[PDB]
Design a protein around this nucleic acid. Structure first.
Lengths: 143, 127, 108, 204, 169
RNA sequence: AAGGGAAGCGCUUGUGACCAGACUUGCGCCCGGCGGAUCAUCCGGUGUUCUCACCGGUGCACUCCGCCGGGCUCAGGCCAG
RNA sequence: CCCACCCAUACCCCGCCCUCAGGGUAGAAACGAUGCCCUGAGGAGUAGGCGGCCGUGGAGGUCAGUGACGAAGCCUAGGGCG
RNA sequence: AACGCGACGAUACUACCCGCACGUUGUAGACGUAUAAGAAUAGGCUCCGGCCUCGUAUCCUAGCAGGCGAUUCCUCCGCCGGCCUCGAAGUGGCCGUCGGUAAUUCGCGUAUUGCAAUUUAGACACGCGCGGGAUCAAAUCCUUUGCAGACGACUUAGAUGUG
């Protein structure tokens, strides 16, 4: 149900119940997803397949830097500096985003929004949040 | 050292004590378990909803028997010669100073056991 | 200004324990799913997570709200009532009480 | 559809006493709040002298020493008859049974807070859906009246006033429906071709 | 020694009596009646009890006690007038007030912090009965004591981040 | 703290109160700074388990012993995915 | 008459205790050999039989045992082993 | 009904009413807790076209747990005032003012809660604080009465009077 470039609904975590795009499928249940950031506020991040739901909608992925994607997918991109930000942060102030993350997010989401604005109301769909409303039965509904 | 030997998990089949029948109604009857010898008594007849009776089935695992939750086996210690007896069992045995050991010999035992790496269960009693 | 909701779980009601005519076994509980009526719809929710969320008197680590976690094991009967195993048996005062059933781990 | 609500308000007219009590008791013990109205409109199958004979046997059963305490208090209101059925159907001598009985409320007629709400019916307990057309049936209100209930006329007159107000409300509702239909037509003569065509395929 | 050991002796005044020839039950009831009050109000109440103006409620030891309207002062119907118990409590209260005066405390603002009535060794008598029996008459003494005092985060990462969010916004 | 015509007892939660453990780092490497000669080998004596050691001498910067300022490996308690 | 469902200490798989039965363990780098390792089966129980462990007062030997920096005793909604 | 209910009088403090700052306060258990015709079922509904197995319906549903700004929109909510309405255990309508408001589109912010950890968020009740208005009460003991009485309990009377 999950392919490179597919909209998923994150169910748990900080961005719970919210739609992003799966870009690359990592190993051991790890998925590299992005909002894109300028669309719904979710940056480049990795989540879990058992906590996402795969939607049948497929986004046109042509025009994205696959070398940039797998360079980010290398297994240090977060943990290498995580300790540095933890030590720096711990009146309250938002700790700064790394320049590498900013640059890769800008390239990736520029390409992705350029592709997304082609089909109608997909930007609004990706910006909107997911919720279950009375009478909605997950065991029957098609995603 | 402080850490003990790697051991299989310590599982306890039953934790609560086996209370003697009618001990909670009669104060001349202590809580220590006694085998009931009646021929119509329901504890012995093993009717449901009554007190349980000790059996060999509740026995603890041989690998984890007589072991504290820390993973050591307690050894009663009266002096420095006893802790030197426990010398070669840092990872398996622990020292428990006897209740009638004076404070000065307790200090000596604690010092020697610290040099030996042997854990003392009651080193902070008179502190 | 949104004006929407935030429910990501399915409502459930803890009804009772698995039991016979006399004996009750607190190891497993019976959960009624909101909107599930048959065994196939239950099989959709087999394996899904479940939380009993309650409130206490003392705040221990920033919250007064405590949780008990578990998962759905198998269907129960023909009504779609599910059998659930928790980390600890439910308080038995939560008979007929609310539980939140989470769609993770998901397979759809 | 196996849905959980705040309070389920059941209009008891045309419902069989035992089956409605069964459904209500199961919901109560499952944890749902139930409010039943028109217990005087509730129905009991069989024939009316059968029901009256059963109630007279109930009246015969009575404590000797002091009727004041301990004796079976023969409640003669239809709301209390339905409550008696539910109480016999629920384990009332326990904390959980007490909680379910506290979740239950039963009334004669439709009080003002509940005449403005939606009253649902239970298909498994409907007299029209259950009884064979040739069989006889009685009414709990008539049984209560001939056993000693004192307020048949009061509830009848209150029901008459409630029906008058309901007729006025339904006149307003029909006006609203006609205006809404005219508005939908007038708007559909506008909107945007694409939009209407698409909403169609989807299903709305 | 006194049971209440949590009160400092430099700020309180204490009185004691041992082996007193009074009824333990009546003394307990009247001590509980005068418990927790001001010294002057307790003295006035006890003198009223002697004068049969006010009565102490019979709460625990209340076998076949007749009713009296004065009992409504206590939310009870059964009240009684233990004159001798009242007299001995007045004696102990005056002794304690003298001790407080000696220590220099303000007698107008003193409350009865602690009061306790215990049983003393019983004192035998014997009387003569028919059918060859002799009835024992153990009198039931009690010890009394009284003391008066002056009246007067290991949050998790998610929690820390969410609180940072609400602090910023 | 509990208490609508008994209490008391077993299995299993939950609340409140009060607590025993565990953990605080150990091991080994890449370095650098040190403080130093209990490295090797050989020679004499001694004791033994006849080939093994201890003493005394010889042996001093990529050899041996302890500390420090770092970096890395592994193993470490509780609950989980 | 048909279908599905509920559960007993029963039936099947796994773990743990104990008992019994069957094997291994010396030119000893060798053992609370009254020990240890492998394999299987079995577990209600009155009268009765056998075995092992727990506790009390006193005696011989030993622990170059404990103790006024506190023995024994007693109390304890404080803990550990069985 | 001594653990069924209503009406009214007076209610000193405590805090009686009013607004919020809330509360490490409680709850047999919020998470859109949305939805009034009546009556019949061998008939019914309707705008009078027609429709009715089917509530697998209608409403509602997008925005840092929902920001700031802008073209466009008079749509939908909320609060207070006036007129009226609701008594079966007491509410809703209209108008007005004021506040908020994607139906279309766009820019800037989300990052770090590190791969999930209840998304601590609702309601009513109760309690601590303020600052605005208002008032300055009773019952019991005691004495007395005999329409009452085993004792309680009850009818009575004590403040200036036909005491």
């Amino acid at each position: 149900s999950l392919q490179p470039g597919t909209v998923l609904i994150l169910l748990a975590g900080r961005f719970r119940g919210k739609r992003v795009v799966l870009l690359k499928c990592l190993d051991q249940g790890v998925l590299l997803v992005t909002g894109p950031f300028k669309i719904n506020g979710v940056p480049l991040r990795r989540v879990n397949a058992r906590y996402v739901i795969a939607t049948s909608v497929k986004v046109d992925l042509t025009g994205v830097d696959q070398a940039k994607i797998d360079e980010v997918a290398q297994p240090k991109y977060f943990t290498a500096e995580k300790a540095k930000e933890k030590a720096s942060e711990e009146k309250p102030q938002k700790k700064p985003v790394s320049s590498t993350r900013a640059a890769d997010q800008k390239a990736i989401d520029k390409a992705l929004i350029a592709n997304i604005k082609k089909v109608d109301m997909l930007a609004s769909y990706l910006a909107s949040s997911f919720s279950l409303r009375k009478g909605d039965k997950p065991h029957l509904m098609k995603f | 050292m402080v850490a003990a030997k790697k051991h299989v998990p310590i599982v306890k089949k039953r934790t609560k004590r086996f209370m003697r029948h009618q001990s909670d109604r009669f104060k001349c009857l202590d809580s220590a378990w006694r085998k009931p010898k009646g021929i119509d008594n329901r504890v012995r007849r093993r009717f449901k909803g009554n007190l349980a009776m000790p059996s060999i089935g509740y026995g603890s695992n041989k690998k984890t028997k007589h072991m504290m939750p820390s993973g050591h086996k307690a050894f009663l210690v009266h002096n420095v010669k006893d802790v030197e007896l426990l010398l070669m069992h840092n990872r398996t045995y622990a020292a428990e100073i006897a209740h009638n050991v004076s404070s000065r010999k307790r200090i000596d035992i604690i010092t020697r056991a610290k040099q030996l790496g042997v854990k003392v269960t009651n080193a902070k009693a008179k502190v | 200004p949104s004006e929407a909701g935030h429910r990501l779980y399915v409502k459930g009601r803890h009804l009772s324990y698995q039991r016979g005519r006399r004996n009750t076994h607190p190891k497993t509980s019976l959960i009624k799913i909101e909107g599930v009526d048959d065994t196939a719809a239950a099989n959709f929710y087999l394996g899904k997570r479940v939380a009993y969320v309650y409130r206490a008197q003392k705040e221990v680590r920033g919250t007064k709200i405590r949780v008990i976690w578990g998962k759905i094991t198998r269907p129960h009967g023909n009504s779609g009532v599910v059998r659930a195993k928790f980390t600890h048996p439910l308080p038995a005062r939560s008979f007929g009480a609310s539980v939140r059933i989470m769609l993770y781990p998901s397979s759809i | 559809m196996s849905s959980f609500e705040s309070v389920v308000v059941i209009d008891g007219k045309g419902h069989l006493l035992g089956r409605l009590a069964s459904i209500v008791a199961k919901q109560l013990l499952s944890g749902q709040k139930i409010v039943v109205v028109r217990c005087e409109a509730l129905n009991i199958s069989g024939e009316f002298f059968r029901a009256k004979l059963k109630y007279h046997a109930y009246l015969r059963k009575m404590t000797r020493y002091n009727p004041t305490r301990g004796g079976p208090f023969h409640f003669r209101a239809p709301s209390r008859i339905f409550y008696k059925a539910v109480r016999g159907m629920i384990p009332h001598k326990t904390a959980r049974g007490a909680a379910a009985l506290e979740r239950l409320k039963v009334f004669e007629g439709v009080p003002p807070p509940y005449d403005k709400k939606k009253k649902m019916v239970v298909p498994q307990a409907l007299r029209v859906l259950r009884l064979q057309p040739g069989r006889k049936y009685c009414t709990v209100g008539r049984l209560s009246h001939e056993v000693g209930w004192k307020y048949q006329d009061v509830v009848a007159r209150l029901e008459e006033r409630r029906k008058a107000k309901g007729a006025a409300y339904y006149e307003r509702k029909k006006l609203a429906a006609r205006q809404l239909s005219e508005a939908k037509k007038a708007a559909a003569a506008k909107v945007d071709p694409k939009v209407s065509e698409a909403l169609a395929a989807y299903g709305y | 020694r006194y049971a209440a050991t949590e009160i400092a002796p430099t700020k309180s005044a204490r009185a004691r009596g041992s082996y007193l020839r009074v009824s333990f039950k009546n003394t307990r009831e009247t001590a509980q009646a005068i418990n927790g009050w001001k010294l002057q109000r307790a003295l006035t109440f006890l003198q009223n009890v002697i004068d049969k103006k006010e009565a102490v409620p019979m709460r625990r030891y209340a076998g076949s006690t007749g009713r009296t309207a004065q009992g409504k002062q206590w939310g009870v119907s059964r009240a009684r007038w233990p004159v001798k118990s009242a007299q001995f409590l007045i004696g102990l209260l005056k002794n304690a007030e003298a001790n407080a005066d000696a220590k220099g405390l303000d007698t107008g603002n003193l409350i009865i912090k602690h009061i306790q009535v215990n049983q003393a060794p019983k004192q035998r008598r014997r009387t003569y009965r028919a059918h060859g029996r002799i009835n024992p008459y153990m009198s039931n003494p009690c010890h009394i004591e009284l003391i008066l005092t002056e009246a007067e985060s290991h949050l998790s990462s998610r929690q820390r981040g969410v609180r940072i969010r609400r602090a910023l916004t």
